[PDB]
Amino acid sequence: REQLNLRESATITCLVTGFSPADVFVQWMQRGQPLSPEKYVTSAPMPEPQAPGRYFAHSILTVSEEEWNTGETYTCVVAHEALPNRVTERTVDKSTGKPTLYNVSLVMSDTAGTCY
Amino acid sequence: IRVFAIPPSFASIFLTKSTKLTCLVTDLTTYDSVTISWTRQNGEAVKTHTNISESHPNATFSAVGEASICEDDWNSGERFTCTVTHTDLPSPLKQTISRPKGVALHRPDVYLLPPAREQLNLRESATITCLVTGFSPADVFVQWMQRGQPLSPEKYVTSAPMPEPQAPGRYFAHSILTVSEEEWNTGETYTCVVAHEALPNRVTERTVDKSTGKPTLYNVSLVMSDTAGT
Amino acid sequence: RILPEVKVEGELGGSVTIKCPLPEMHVRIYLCREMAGSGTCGTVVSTTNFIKAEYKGRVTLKQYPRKNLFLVEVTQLTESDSGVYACGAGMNTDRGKTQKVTLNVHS
Amino acid sequence: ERIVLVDNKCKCARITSRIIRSSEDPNEDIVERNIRIIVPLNNRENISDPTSPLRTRFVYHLSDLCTCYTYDRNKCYTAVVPLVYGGETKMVETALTPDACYP
Ligand SMILES: *[C@@H]1O[C@H](CO)[C@@H](O)[C@H](O)[C@H]1NC(C)=O
Numbered sequence: 001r002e003q004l005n006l007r008e009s010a011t012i013t014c015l016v017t018g019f020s021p022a023d024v025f026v027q028w029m030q031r032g033q034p035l036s037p038e039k040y041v042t043s044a045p046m047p048e049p050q051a052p053g054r055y056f057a058h059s060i061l062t063v064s065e066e067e068w069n070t071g072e073t074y075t076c077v078v079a080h081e082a083l084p085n086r087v088t089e090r091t092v093d094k095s096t097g098k099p100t101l102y103n104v105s106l107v108m109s110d111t112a113g114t115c116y
Numbered sequence: 117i118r119v120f121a122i123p124p125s126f127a128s129i130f131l132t133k134s135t136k137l138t139c140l141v142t143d144l145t146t147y148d149s150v151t152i153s154w155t156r157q158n159g160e161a162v163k164t165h166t167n168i169s170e171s172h173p174n175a176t177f178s179a180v181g182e183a184s185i186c187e188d189d190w191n192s193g194e195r196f197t198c199t200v201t202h203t204d205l206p207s208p209l210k211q212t213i214s215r216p217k218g219v220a221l222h223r224p225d226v227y228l229l230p231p232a233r234e235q236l237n238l239r240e241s242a243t244i245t246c247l248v249t250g251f252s253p254a255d256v257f258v259q260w261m262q263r264g265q266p267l268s269p270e271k272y273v274t275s276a277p278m279p280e281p282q283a284p285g286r287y288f289a290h291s292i293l294t295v296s297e298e299e300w301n302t303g304e305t306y307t308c309v310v311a312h313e314a315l316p317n318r319v320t321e322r323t324v325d326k327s328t329g330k331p332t333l334y335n336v337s338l339v340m341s342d343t344a345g346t
Numbered sequence: 347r348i349l350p351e352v353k354v355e356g357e358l359g360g361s362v363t364i365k366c367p368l369p370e371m372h373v374r375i376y377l378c379r380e381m382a383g384s385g386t387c388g389t390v391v392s393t394t395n396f397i398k399a400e401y402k403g404r405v406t407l408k409q410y411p412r413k414n415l416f417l418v419e420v421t422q423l424t425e426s427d428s429g430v431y432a433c434g435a436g437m438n439t440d441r442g443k444t445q446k447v448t449l450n451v452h453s
Numbered sequence: 454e455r456i457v458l459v460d461n462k463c464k465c466a467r468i469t470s471r472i473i474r475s476s477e478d479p480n481e482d483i484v485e486r487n488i489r490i491i492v493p494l495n496n497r498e499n500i501s502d503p504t505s506p507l508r509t510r511f512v513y514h515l516s517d518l519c520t521c522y523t524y525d526r527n528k529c530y531t532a533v534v535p536l537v538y539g540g541e542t543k544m545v546e547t548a549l550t551p552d553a554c555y556p
């Protein structure tokens with residue numbers, strides 16, 4: 001939230017943790033259109049502190065603030081050998097994340113016995 | 117002298133696979149060589165009966181004549197005739213059984229009413245009423261089950277199908293079941309199961325217990341966890 | 347959840363027929379006039395022979411399995427027939443409505 | 454305007470979300486969580502056998518929300534009813550939900 005208050009650039013980070021061995025891939029897609037390395041970077045692959053079993057890497061994307069009034073959902077796609085389809089696409093936008101207002105509206109009826 | 121003409125109930129045609137037809141004699145003298153025969157509308161004879169019954173303690177005889185027919189013949193509306201010939205009456209008496217076609221088939225609606233509040237105050241007995249409305253034609257089969265097993269007809273009484281006020285030809289019927297008062301307060305769920313032709317599955321049921329019929333307690337303990345989640 | 351509010355005009359002599367969708371599985375198909383004051387729905391036409399007391403003898407049900415339109419017709423209009431007539435299915439009436447529409451008097 | 458995040462029909466939860474378009478201010482927006490559980494209040498323990506105690510608990514973990522309380526309107530639930538009519542016992546399939554399914 002602090003970075004978004006500067007209205008300059010929000011950076012989305014994609015963590016690929018617990019993977020072994022190295023050389024795991026990463027790519028960013030905006031609305032299903034491939035994202036080049038001009039606008040994104042990846043941590044060269046790395047190692048873990050408590051367990052030596054798997055190593056970690058990271059990737060961060062750069063954008064503007066007006067872009068986070070529409071989202072475009074900025075999917076982070078990965079490619080590693082220990083994957084069924086070598087793809088584990090994940091995406092997060094403003095709609096998901098931490099919400100600031102819950103209103104549960106549980107109703108109780110004596111005749112809504114088959115939730116239509 | 118009296119001779120009956122009992123049409124086969126739907127509870128026979130659908131369950132016993134024995135859609136036969138029987139005519140019973142009564143109010144006659146204790147005699148033999150009774151010629152009770154079933155015939156079709158063309159005058160031809162059909163299969164006969166067996167195992168002639170025994171007389172009644174009222175010093176009146178009782179016998180039954182039976183004929184086995186197929187279901188499609190019944191659903192076509194054929195006029196079968198039972199004829200009784202005896203020395204008592206110089207003229208054989210005929211009785212006609214058929215199916216009057218041209219009547220709509222409506223599906224019964226089953227309503228299970230629990231006993232009234234003031235009835236569960238004398239602490240003597242409770243009456244649960246199974247009301248079937250809208251069904252046409254008559255002759256519907258109804259029975260009761262207590263914890264998944266049926267009961268004898270010595271504890272529940274059904275009523276004859278009577279016409280409906282606002283309906284042209286639809287009917288209604290009542291079946292009351294009386295049980296001990298303490299047999300209804302502890303639980304002991306009762307079910308009313310009915311079987312009329314028009315039902316898409318030909319059999320439906322309803323159920324009541326102490327916690328369902330007009331309850332005085334909505335004991336709710338709803339819990340909701342992991343509101344945020346993923 | 348369809349809301350095709352149409353402006354079909356009505357009068358004493360005038361007749362207006364509503365159109366409704368049918369599941370065609372011979373369930374309970376009904377047209378129901380919602381009451382604003384009551385907050386519930388009161389069936390004006392049902393699959394059974396029921397007809398509303400105000401609408402006795404002046405309404406007709408017309409079912410075509412061929413064309414997939416379920417339509418009901420009103421013979422005379424007293425000009426008081428202005429409300430949310432919703433169609434539907436299931437045993438239930440209120441919570442089972444499929445499409446709703448409000449008819450109109452004069453024009 | 455609201456994305457249908459969950460439309461569960463067996464426990465009847467209808468969780469969803471949206472972004473409320475506030476004024477043209479810094480992005481102090483609000484994310485919505487319109488969870489809408491409906492309580493049957495009259496169903497049984499198993500949904501498909503009317504012989505058990507009725508229903509006390511109503512547990513809703515929204516992580517296993519993407520045994521039931523309610524009845525699916527497009528599904529059919531039936532049972533075997535043990536009728537007799539005399540000596541024979543034709544255990545016949547009944548209907549616990551007349552109108553959601555036809556023979
Ligand atoms: C939940 O909140 C939103 C806006 O905060 C509101 O539009 C919606 O009606 C609320 N839900 C209920 C059930 O009132």
Ligand SMILES: *[C@@H]1O[C@H](CO)[C@@H](O)[C@H](O)[C@H]1NC(C)=O
Pocket residue numbers: 335336337509
């Ligand atoms: C009401 O529900 C609670 C929760 O399980 C239960 O402990 C209690 O026995 C119930 N009360 C009655 C009268 O059954």
Ligand SMILES: *[C@@H]1O[C@H](CO)[C@@H](O)[C@H](O)[C@H]1NC(C)=O
Pocket residue numbers: 498499500501502
């Ligand atoms: C009661 O619940 C059990 C548990 O799933 C299930 O077999 C069924 O819904 C009910 N039992 C019977 C015998 O119908």
